[PDB]
Symmetry: D3
Subunit: 219 residues, 6 copies
């Protein structure tokens, strides 16, 4: 059951409204690595996660992401607030889509559920969640490097922080299953070619050397 | 440059043609967790990966996935050959689209680059590659349990096996950077709320408690 | 700020699990007229709705829809629970996508934000919300006509009920603005052709007759 | 059958060519609230609307929208003619896509039938048509305020005017069924929780209180 | 301007309703090779084709494609009407989407303008149209071989026949420009490699023999 | 099987980085007329083309299209590397998506298999390919006229030239089947209306004159 308290976790604080940046910020509202993606991925996973311990974790983190989503939407509201007659505004998608957040990315691409990565075994879900957090932190860094003022930059820092936090949670959820560094899961046992490496593009490293792999220099 | 030799990795060996299974098999041709996704994700990453070692690894694997894509395509061609009058065939999308593989999934959804997860830091790429590898293994397991004949099963088992192989390659690469189990990456320093968990939805675990998290029961 | 209490408003109650129907039910999870659509439309609208009275209404209804979304996801979980070896299951998308809800419709189409209808003046938002409720109720009726058991049929009846409720709320939100039956809004005054009707496909009614319109039988 | 005569409704009268505005104008050619959406939504409804009167109305309007689509297309052709060397033109999608209209929106998003809202009950269709009409009017207003010359503005004003006209036609049709202000439609009888409001997020209103709703302050 | 008389190019007649065939038939309505693709592509091209003769031809053909679209819709309508309770109907997407045509294909994929090939040069446009025609005729043939009855079969045969006609029109247009059998077009001068053929996959034919090509047997 | 050597068809050389041109260049990478469309379309066709000669030709060409794709990627890479701080770069989608090519077009649209035209008959396939080639050459020309420097211009000229080459290959293949100038193909016999031309829009040409057509001046 969903409840809602109106004010956000952190609080809206920006400088002069920056509509051009607000459009870049849509990437974390309606974009692939955005907050809607995280919130919906971890939540839809929880429905088929049998272990109550991890199902709870997914739901806690998911609900937090709904609050991050709320926050980003407020930054976008403020950065497109009372500036609809400026020329900076007129060069943004907000000029035709209206002020405020919209569930699209910075390129105007509507949010798709193809952004999501979930299903089957919990190992896939957790590994997909780790990847989604990596994408999230990445986009948050690029936006911080482009942030208009300081109040924005630090709200984005807090968000970027929580994704590093979440990354740990998922990493520890896997560790409890002993599947953190163990590449194998599922029920299908591998054949004899499992430790082979094919040099199909022609460099050496631990990914193609002993004791981990039998390197095949020329197929 | 690309080069192609006509012989596949493993020759196609199927029982009687099963066009309904052929449609399910499209999940690995034009599906989200499919071979085109793997091939394109790793290859597009190689254009912005600086480490010459890791870049080469991404290309080696990507080229293999193209060859996996070929095998999946040959399986689908075989299970839809000379059967366009059976009622099984007429209940598939192959009846209107034509025999052989197409870049759709099992639900007829056209492949979309929205499936891909890539960009920026190599830590993200490798983590995205590990997640992608999981979903590929998962989908392959489901197809294995639904396989129509033993020859088809073995070909799918080998394909699944290579995803296990690829997972290890990606882990060893991520581990060689010391970032396989280290949640932090990037340039943005974390703040004060890093090691805090919020009970926004009581099940507990290492993701939730000491020594890595301070539990907040009621926010 | 989002909070979550684990158990749903109503309670899971079905008969024998029906995976084929569960797929039809995805229409209200990840479909156009589904619960995610309503929840996200009314919520993203609230960010640019200036009137606090209506902004609150949108948020109340939106949060309720998140709980409807939770409910439908539980029906789908139950109707795909412990049936993964039946042949009914094997003919569904769940066979390859895994058990449990997924943010796609009954046709396997991923949820898109193009489903959403919002922006600009509150009159558009409310009229779009009325339309979204009409679509919602429609799909709920078709599913009720196809429901497997009685416990399902009545959970769907309660959902269909609340959408008729919501329809009223929006209809009364417009009435408070005096824009319920008044076709005009915005700031652009119409020209002289506003009351014309062009017979471009060649029947009469109030939509093309006096006193409302000047009918043009032949352009 | 369809018939086309080469002369548009209003001849194109623009100032100097403005290719940047031409891109914004694509919102009414290949955009969500655009003329193709209106034309196709109303037309596809006519195939399942039983009432011979309403069905004819949908076709009359749909054919007009096709003619509106033509005018928008002519506007876009005019504002992108013989200017492919100006730097304004080179900053638009017309530089790679070619001059003239294309079935994309102002962000380059290909038109998608996901824009359409239709199906089942005629009450839904008309309500979907009213909502669609609102978004069309809204987008037209924004384009009017951003128009490059007076001749372009007047053409857009007339187009906006017809959407006001169409809204009334749809209202009169919905009213003739007694369903313009009546929230109920369909065959499924409502249950016990029909007239109940939940304060899940205190602002009050006719949507929230007596005599139509029993307020639930804390669920 | 557009105009519409109510009877199709010719009477549509079917046997009993076959809703399962109607879903397949959606390919020619909201599918890639369907009538909407043909209509829109040729029409959108007319806005930038400078040859008044070829422009008119495109318009002539597009308007006929609209009439074909109406026919396909009416066939789909007839094959889905009054058969709600039948088990065949319940196995189709019409069960949840409603009776009659919808702008999607046989798989439930919403129609997208990405189906269209157009822009820039008339030679590109005309070649695209010949290709689109070939896809339409191909799809029609597959439907014809799946025909539920004879009345339907003869309608689809006529529609197929008209695509052959259009192909001849487009070829005559291409041939009037001298570009039907001459590959070169545009304003860019080719370099020294225009006659090279690379044997990158390992067969001979006119595509890699003298006089036309310098065959590179081993790159 | 697939194989990869590391150097392209020829050396890629540019001037200074022009990230704004690199975004335009994405059309030939992840765009509709791009190299991925060409590669995948011709390759996927090879799985169902029965003519061993034409099958091999399709494979030969597709593998070359892959090499072109690598080149386009490398051009995009060079034009986006080491220029993060520059204001031009910050105006591009690379600012949020990262340096280098991504499988999207100049508008940010993710690549989709809906760009592909294929299936059924080799004649349909070959005509589709001639059309795809025409789109590629057209796009290349627009990029060439927008070239940032001479090194880039000469690479795009070569790539354009190779499309002219492919067009000749596909034409020779079509001509070997006797279907280059003959519209008819497939297994369905046309009816009595194959030579009719309808003047539905109101010009004359070989597309509607004797000997080929019976012109219907007024339907
Ligand atoms: Ca290597
Ligand atoms: Ca489907
Ligand atoms: Ca908890
Ligand atoms: Ca009429
Ligand atoms: Ca864009
Ligand atoms: Ca409230
Ligand atoms: Ca789809
Ligand atoms: Ca060869
Ligand atoms: Ca898009
Ligand atoms: Ca004409
Ligand atoms: Mn977050
Ligand atoms: Mn997170
Ligand atoms: Mn693979
Ligand atoms: Mn793999
Ligand atoms: Mn609801
Ligand atoms: Mn509702
Ligand atoms: Mn209009
Ligand atoms: Mn209208
Ligand atoms: Mn046609
Ligand atoms: Mn045609
Ligand atoms: Mn090429
Ligand atoms: Mn080519």
């Amino acid at each position: 059951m969903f409840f809602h308290k109106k004010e956000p976790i952190h609080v809206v604080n920006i400088g002069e409204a920056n509509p051009r940046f607000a459009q870049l910020l849509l990437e974390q509202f309606g974009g692939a690595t955005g907050e809607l993606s995280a919130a919906l991925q971890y939540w839809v996973q929880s429905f088929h996660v049998e272990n109550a311990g991890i199902k709870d974790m997914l739901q806690d983190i998911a609900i937090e992401e709904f609050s991050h989503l709320e926050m980003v939407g407020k930054l976008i509201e403020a950065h497109t607030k009372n500036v609809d007659q400026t020329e900076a505004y007129k060069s943004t998608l907000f000029a035709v889509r209206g002020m405020g957040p919209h569930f699209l990315d910075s390129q105007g691409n509507a949010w798709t559920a193809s952004y999501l990565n979930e299903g089957g075994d919990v190992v896939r879900d957790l590994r997909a969640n780790i990847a989604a957090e990596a994408g999230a932190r990445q986009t948050y860094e690029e936006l911080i490097k482009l942030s208009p003022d300081e109040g924005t930059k630090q709200t984005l820092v807090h968000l970027l922080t929580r994704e590093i936090s979440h990354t740990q949670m998922f990493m520890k959820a896997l560790d409890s299953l002993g599947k953190l560094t163990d590449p194998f899961f599922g029920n299908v046992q591998p054949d004899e070619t499992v430790a082979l490496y094919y040099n199909l593009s022609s460099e050496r490293g631990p990914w193609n050397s002993e004791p981990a792999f039998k390197y095949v220099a020329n197929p």
